[PDB]
Design a protein around this nucleic acid. Structure first.
Lengths: 95, 66, 155
RNA sequence: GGGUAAUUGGCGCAGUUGGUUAGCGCGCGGGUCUCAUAAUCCCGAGGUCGUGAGUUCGAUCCUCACAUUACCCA
RNA sequence: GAUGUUAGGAGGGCAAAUCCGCCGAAUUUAAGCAUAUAAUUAAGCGGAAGAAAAGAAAAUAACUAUGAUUCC
RNA sequence: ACGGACCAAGGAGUCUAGCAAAUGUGCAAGUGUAUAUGAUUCUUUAAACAUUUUACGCAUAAUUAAUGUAAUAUGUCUAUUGUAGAUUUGUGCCCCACUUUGCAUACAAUACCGGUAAGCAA
RNA sequence: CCUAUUAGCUGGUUAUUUUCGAAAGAUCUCUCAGGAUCGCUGGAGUUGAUUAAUAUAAUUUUACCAGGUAGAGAUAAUGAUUAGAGGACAGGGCCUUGACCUAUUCUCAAACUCCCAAUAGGUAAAAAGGGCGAAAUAACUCAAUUUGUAUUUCACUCAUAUUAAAUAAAAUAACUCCAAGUGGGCCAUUUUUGGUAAGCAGAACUGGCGAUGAGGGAUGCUCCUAACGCUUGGAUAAGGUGCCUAAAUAUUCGCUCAUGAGAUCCCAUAAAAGGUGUUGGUUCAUAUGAACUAGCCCUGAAAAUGGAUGGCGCUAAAGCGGA
RNA sequence: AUCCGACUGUUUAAUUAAAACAUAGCAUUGUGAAAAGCCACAACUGGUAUUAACACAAUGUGAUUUCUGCCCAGUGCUUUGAAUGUCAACUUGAUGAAAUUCAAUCAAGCGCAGGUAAACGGCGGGAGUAACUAUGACUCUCUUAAGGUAGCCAAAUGCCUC
RNA sequence: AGGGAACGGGCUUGGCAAAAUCAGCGGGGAAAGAAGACCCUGUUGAGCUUUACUCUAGUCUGGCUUUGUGAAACGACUUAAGAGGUGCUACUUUUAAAGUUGUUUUAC
RNA sequence: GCAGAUGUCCAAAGACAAGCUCAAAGAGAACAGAAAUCUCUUGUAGACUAAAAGGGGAAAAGCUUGUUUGAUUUCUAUUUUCAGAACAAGUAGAAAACGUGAAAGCGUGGCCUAUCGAUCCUUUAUAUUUGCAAAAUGACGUAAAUUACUUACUACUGUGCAUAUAGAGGUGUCUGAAAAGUUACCACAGGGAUAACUGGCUUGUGGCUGCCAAGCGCUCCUAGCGACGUAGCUUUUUGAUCCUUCGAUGUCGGCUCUUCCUAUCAUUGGGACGCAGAAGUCUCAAAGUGUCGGAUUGUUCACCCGCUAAUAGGGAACGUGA
RNA sequence: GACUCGUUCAUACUACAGUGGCCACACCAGAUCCCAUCAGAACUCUGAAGUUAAGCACUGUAAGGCUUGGCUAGUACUGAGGUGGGAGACCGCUCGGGAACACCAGGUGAUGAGUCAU
RNA sequence: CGCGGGGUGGAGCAGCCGGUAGCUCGUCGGGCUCAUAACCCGAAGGUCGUCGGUUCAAAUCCGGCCCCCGCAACCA
RNA sequence: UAUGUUC
């Protein structure tokens, strides 16, 4: 799967026209320790009792859905556009 | 153990015990997702008709009650 | 195990012998109005607006008309009750039903019969006849064609 | 997913702003009769892309590419 | 500090329904089970009274403000 | 296939909490006097009776995570609009078709309230 | 002692009559001995009907739809498949071998189709409606402020005195609420998949058994008649009438002799192959010789306790096929 | 005469008395001491120990005779390390207004480098080949950490197999 | 014998069938024992084992505290000058031994 | 049950438009051949359309070219499965902004039928929407006034965190637990819903009996056989099933004892022969009588030694363990 | 006689022939321009010298195909009943429904709106 | 039977990771030697077990067969 | 003080 770096597409925020958009791939980002779920999990894990939450260990699928981050060049607002799952994904490869 | 997988036996007489019920077939149907720009105009038509009828009736009532 | 949209439609959704190709241009000219009866016949050459397998050959009233589609109310049997279903199809897959054409012709004919019957104050039976037993007929036949029949032997 | 190291000649290998350099491999000649020993050219995207910088494989960066530990509430 | 059959005194054990400290499960439920629940429970140890314990704000509130504790 | 040698006596959907539906009863936009108090009631009586002119629960208003906001709208003590529809009114004290009114309810349409979109936005 | 721990599992679960009356499918489920949910059921209540009509209908008729199963075909296509016949690229010695082409020919398909039933299925058959007009409304539509569309209001009137086809103990309806049990099924006819087959395993339709007795099939959960308050008469169904056993040793016409005759669906086994047994037919040869044909009978036809058309027995049937 | 166990001894009280256990003999391992080895205990403290390597503790094998082959690749166990990667708490530093967020390093362990099989254990396959036939001393080749050595056998161990 | 839950004492059709008793016997009563110990199921256990999941005594190691009194060496921080490239200014090396801290060794 | 397929692939293989027509065959053209390129004729698709199969497709849905990003944001009515819940995958539309075309139009991914995922948690985007419980934090910002606790008016207000909405990180047992074995020491609740043994249906397999006649039999199908085929019987083998028994029907063999069957081994009486005699073989009526001693093995089975007249085959819950 | 836009989508198609043309379609003459390619072949543009040779129209063929009817045939198959027959495989009867291939014969079109020419 | 691996020169084995099939021994030829070995030089030999399918392209990828090998065939 | 078979 190959998609180009830029795309003329409708902008759904702050500028209601078709504009140029920079296209990149969205990345998950680290889970911060100060998130409420993480704090609750750490407090629960403290003490005796062992592992207190499930740990998933099945791992059926081998790919991930590809999420494009679209950044409008005129009104600097970003958007998410999910694509079908694929094994190989390149951004702006040769035609 | 091995179980009976499937059968449609007795299902028809179960269905016919309370009869095959028919849809109620009401006179009016909701126009919620049907033909916008047409049913909106129909709303305008009804409003105009109601306004004319109501103003004529109000005129008659006022002139008859003095 | 396999229950896709078009499962089991190998022959139902196939074009007839020497009847392939898109619909005629005259099909797009037919008039549809709200509440009139319509036949759902799937045309495999047009893939969008294709009705589900069950509704091919069914009849229903129009409840919605769009620019190239139509919504039709079809009764479908679901175990212990009939229930209404709103199927949305393109106009290629729908056709003006003749289920009531005899009714409309009867309506106009009976109207113009009753008009003159009341004009001449003659009382007329207007209902359909379901004709049964024939009267006695005093029929002539010359003896040149009263041929006698015998059961045939075996060969 | 974190940290570290590595992949530049066919093999192996270290080297970084005024730089591609080598032992083995290739080829013949040669050698004291045949093994064992010197010699020349052939062998390199300095893994990949981009970036900084009169003056870089070189400086930074990201992509996959391997080996160690260590991490697992999707 | 010791030592004293110096003088005068106290503690010890029983009993527990209510009461005050400690210690401390699992059965069970989750239709499995490990956090959780059972339960700050049962069992175990100690300590009081006709009641005990708590109690005269390092308290609430945010109001036009209340005013130790306990209980309904 | 399992239980039953015989007889007598005992022997198993109950009690409490909480919710709803159904039905009966009382009152009704209110309903229930909670705990508690008083009273020539004090065998019964541990029940009966009572409650100096915004306690509390549920209901009377919804919607939103939420700051919050909150139901025609002052032309009018008419009380949104249709199609059916009970009852009523007259004409052809008892048959029927036209009139009159239009309960409950059903199917829709309209407004208006809260939230979200969209447009505008001092 | 916590503790009467828990148990989707086994056992038990206490008066009468009356009325109504199931499911053993389906969806999800760490689900397959369970549960929730739908369906089937009861009770309660309202709205209706009570106006031989409307709603309504496991029914038909009329009109109009949709289908590719049975069948058919192999020369219509695809996929197979046996043979020759005729005729202008290859091989050898004008000849042969073939290939190829043409017209034929034998035979096939659940995953083939030019064609295509029967059965099954759908829609419609008028009054809250239709038809025909005028006037209003709209921000819709159109080239159209008067094109069209829709709505509204006025008109006229479209069988009803048999009812816009027939028939209908059709309102015993419709709807709402609460809730039980059930969610192991099995059998028969017909169709059908796997299997050598099975009282095997898995499906479809309807009817049953289950949940249900009664008469018959000697006997029998499912076959036939027929479903059930307590009685008196009558007459029958299925099936029987020699005795068991109520009723014919009835009548009438044929067939059959069995040294293992035969004798009521399910049903309680019988085949290929034979007979110069006898009874009818058919086609050939001058009342003769053949070849066939099909009724009953016979051979084929062997199993273990003693033995079963149910028993006795039955042959001028009490057997077989009729009337 | 064969098998097993060397023997004396012991055992599944109430279905197994044996070839099972023990045994002497043999071998291996840990430990130089109250900061040791092995073990007990909640703590305090203790057993061995009134002990001291000819000892105590932990294993395997199982008299004598004759022997006890190869493999440290794997898994264990174990030995050295400022060359060494990784890591926790802590600490230090940077930034911030602070919480925080970032970095940095002399632990053990693992990893790296060795040792160890009387530790757990493991210990190959195709072809061709000798004046009859047969077999294959011999040869070629694939391959392992090593390819089952000395012995022994249809054994209480061999299916085929009577 | 039949059919039946496919092996009856009972049912159907037959054979038959005549009181009470004594002693043996082991064909049958699918005889008795006894909620099959084999097998399967149960979201019922238990014993045992491991490189199952999650933990834990013990054990090894580090940090803080206990923890006092001295010395030396090294390191780091702070501070003044030199040198390199270098846009009144910014980074790197060295020189002092100047004040502060940490570590390693050693003494009581 | 049968033949398969899926967990993908595609900035084009998506969108629009235009032009063109494909597979194959025949004939012809230096190298040049069965195939290399070119020309003509025929060519209903016999090509191609990402993949399995089935539908669809010829001025196209195929090939080529041009321009593009509609593979976009938001919301309905709904279809499939179905409880008429969800996800998912679709259909018809509406509000924006676009692409393409001259335009009518077409485009909300792939010509259609498959290609996928809840709660909680995390993550990143959007917001003139909110909160962090007595308050403030842009900012004394803008206008007036004095030595102050002055007065009016400002959509835009600290870090961190939490919320709303939208995607994504995944549960393939795919309506979604974080999970290795062994018990021959075993326990309990049950199950004939379910195996191991009898019995029952079936008879592939085992055993037995027929029909035909190519051949064998020196010649001669049938004295005796009988291939290629084909019809049955039996329940003495083993299977198949799971109908009855799991609140228990004592599971091999032998010994002992009785009875039964006949598909007769011997004995009786017969028929045929490829029958001289002798011996034997095939066969009929016949179950009255009898069918043995031993070595090895737990055996059944088997195999030898030996006698015999013959040492036949079977059943009785694989007859028979109070 | 003809043309444009259609409808039906083979009675309309296919092959081989014959006939026909004044405006009519068309073949045809050219490439300056818009446009287009390797190629004015096509497409596009500008024309009117020539021709019915072709396209087109009409007709023909014991033509193929298509179509309609007959016949196959009350055959095949099939709904309902049967204490019907048969050992079974299968096959009748009663109340009903009813094909297909092949073969034979006829046919080879019809038509809406508008327009041109005479 | 359930699998889950392999068939390539005469032998044993690579490429077998789609396009250009390698090494050793073997065989042939010539040298060296009186001769034979060893040695030196230079060649040749693979139809990739078989039949289909995908692909521009298959010995390679996908199936179906023919052999080879290795496990499994347990509770009564 | 490389190795270097046989007839």
């Amino acid at each position: 799967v190959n998609v180009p770096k830029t795309r003329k597409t409708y902008c759904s925020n702050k500028c209601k026209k078709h504009t140029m958009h920079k296209v990149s791939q969205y990345k998950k980002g680290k889970e911060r320790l100060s998130s409420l779920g993480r704090r609750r999990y750490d407090m629960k894990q403290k003490g005796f009792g062992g592992q207190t939450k499930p740990v998933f260990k099945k791992k059926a699928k081998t790919t991930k859905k590809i999420v494009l981050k679209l950044e409008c060049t005129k009104c600097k607002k970003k958007r998410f556009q999910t694509m079908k799952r694929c094994k190989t994904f390149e951004m702006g490869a040769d035609k | 153990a091995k179980s009976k997988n499937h059968t449609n036996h007795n299902q028809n007489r179960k269905a016919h015990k309370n009869g095959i019920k028919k849809p109620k077939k009401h006179k009016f149907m909701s126009r919620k997702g049907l033909d916008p720009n047409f049913f909106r105009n129909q709303k305008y038509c009804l409003k105009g008709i109601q306004k004319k009828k109501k103003e004529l009736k109000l005129k008659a009532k006022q002139e008859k009650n003095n | 195990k396999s229950r896709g949209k078009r499962s089991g439609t190998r022959y139902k959704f196939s074009k007839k012998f020497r009847k392939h190709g898109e619909c005629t241009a005259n099909k797009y000219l037919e008039k549809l109005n709200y509440g009139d009866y319509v036949d759902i016949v799937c045309d495999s050459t047009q893939q969008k607006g294709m009705p589900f397998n069950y509704y091919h050959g069914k009849t229903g009233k129009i409840f919605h008309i769009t620019k190239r589609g139509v919504g039709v109310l079809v009764n479908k049997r679901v175990k212990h009750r009939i229930e209404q279903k709103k199927v949305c199809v393109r106009i290629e897959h729908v056709r003006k039903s003749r289920c009531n054409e005899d009714f409309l012709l009867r309506k106009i004919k009976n109207a113009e019969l009753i008009k003159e019957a009341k004009l001449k104050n003659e009382h007329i039976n207007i209902k359909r006849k379901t004709e049964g037993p024939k009267p006695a007929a005093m029929i002539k036949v010359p003896p040149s064609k009263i041929i006698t029949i015998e059961p045939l032997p075996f060969y």
